[PDB]
Design a protein around this ligand. Structure first.
Ligand SMILES: O=c1[nH]cnc2c(-n3cc(CCN4CCC(c5cccc(C(F)(F)F)c5)CC4)cn3)nccc12
Ligand SMILES: [Cl-]
Ligand SMILES: [Zn+2]
Ligand SMILES: [Zn+2]
Length: 338
């Protein structure tokens, strides 16, 4: 299933869309996890909120001005924490002549403009806002309450809001503890994504180590600082397999364990995201290479190994667990579909 490891798009019916965890097992049975990123288009009848016309006075406690330094496909992004602003003030800045999306025909024209201007006119990203835009009664794919195996930890299971503007970006990274992630684009302009399949993740890390040797000597997982931007042209020049996709409003993006992703916002928008787990993540959690310099998001794997791997719990707590992770295998929950 999915030998090419290309990004897959799913269109579930209302019946299929009801159980979130069973649907993740279904897209895995179809090999969507091989790409590292999958798109889920929900049924037209499904809506997480009736109106977004009441969030003008919602506070963005720490907007970040993104300063990008670099040349010829390789860039470093630096954040400047600005003081608290409202969605109203942010939308006014996002839509102004200084920060607005340039005029474009197709995505490729906008993508070229992005890679050519990302170091000029630093944009502001309304990133990591603690909160949700889902209404109380919404039981399907409610990012603020997914009901996955990650809940046995209890701030990794909490939703975050991302208010974008043109040219705001997210650097090459995997999820904390190499977890899964769900991203819902509530409204606004698209969000473009790049992904490297989990089976090629080490090729990207080796490439990144070669470009930033000082950053690699100072940190075992320097890509976890989320500061490294690498263009598709640079990835193509050094033979890194990758795929790209554009997420539009009302669509979900799913990231899979050890699936490296990056991207940018086309203009003013709002995305809600959280992390989640399946039985397959457990092995990735145990084997995760964490940021050594900063003291970073770390989950104690003991509770997970004792509940879902009881037979191997003593061998692992000894330090003799030599399990090699096969990235192509779907989650055990996918058995019913196979
Ligand atoms: O659109 C995005 N904007 C910003 N951050 C994104 C992202 N992550 C951010 C994190 C950091 C979360 N941390 C704080 C916990 C992890 N993934 N992953 C995908 C998409 C985005
Ligand atoms: Cl709005
Ligand atoms: Zn991410
Ligand atoms: Zn570090």
């Amino acid at each position: 299933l999915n030998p090419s490891a290309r990004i897959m798009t799913f269109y579930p019916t209302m019946e299929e869309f009801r159980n979130f965890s069973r649907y993740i097992a279904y897209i895995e049975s179809q090999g969507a996890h091989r790409a590292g990123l999958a798109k889920v288009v929900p049924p037209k009848e499904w809506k997480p909120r009736a109106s977004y016309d009441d969030i003008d006075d919602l506070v963005i406690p720490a907007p970040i001005q993104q300063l990008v330094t670099g040349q010829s496909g390789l860039f470093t992004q630096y954040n400047i924490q600005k003081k608290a602003m409202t969605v109203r003030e942010f939308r006014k800045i996002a839509n102004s002549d200084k920060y607005c999306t340039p005029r474009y025909s197709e995505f490729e024209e906008l993508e070229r403009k992005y890679w050519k201007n990302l170091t000029f006119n630093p944009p502001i990203y309304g990133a990591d806002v603690n909160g949700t835009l889902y209404e109380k009664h919404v039981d399907e794919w409610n990012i603020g309450r997914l009901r996955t195996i990650l809940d046995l930890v209890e701030g990794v299971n909490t939703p975050y809001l991302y208010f974008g503007m043109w040219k705001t970006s997210f650097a090459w990274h995997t999820e904390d503890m190499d977890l899964y992630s769900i991203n819902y684009l509530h409204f606004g302009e698209p969000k473009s994504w790049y992904s490297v399949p989990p089976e090629h993740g080490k090729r990207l890390e080796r490439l990144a180590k070669g470009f930033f040797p000082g950053s690699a000597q100072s940190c075992e997982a320097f890509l976890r600082h989320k500061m490294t931007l690498i263009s598709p042209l640079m990835l193509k020049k050094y033979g890194i397999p990758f795929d790209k996709v554009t997420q539009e409003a009302g669509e979900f993006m799913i990231t899979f364990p050890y699936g490296y992703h990056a991207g940018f916002n086309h203009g003013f928008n709002c995305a809600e995201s959280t992390n989640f787990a399946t039985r397959r993540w457990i092995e990735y959690g145990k084997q995760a290479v964490l940021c050594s310099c900063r003291k970073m998001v770390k989950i104690s794997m003991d509770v997970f190994v004792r509940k879902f791997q009881p037979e191997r719990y003593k061998l692992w707590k000894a330090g003799k667990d030599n399990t090699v992770i096969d990235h192509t295998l779907p989650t055990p929950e996918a058995a019913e579909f196979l």
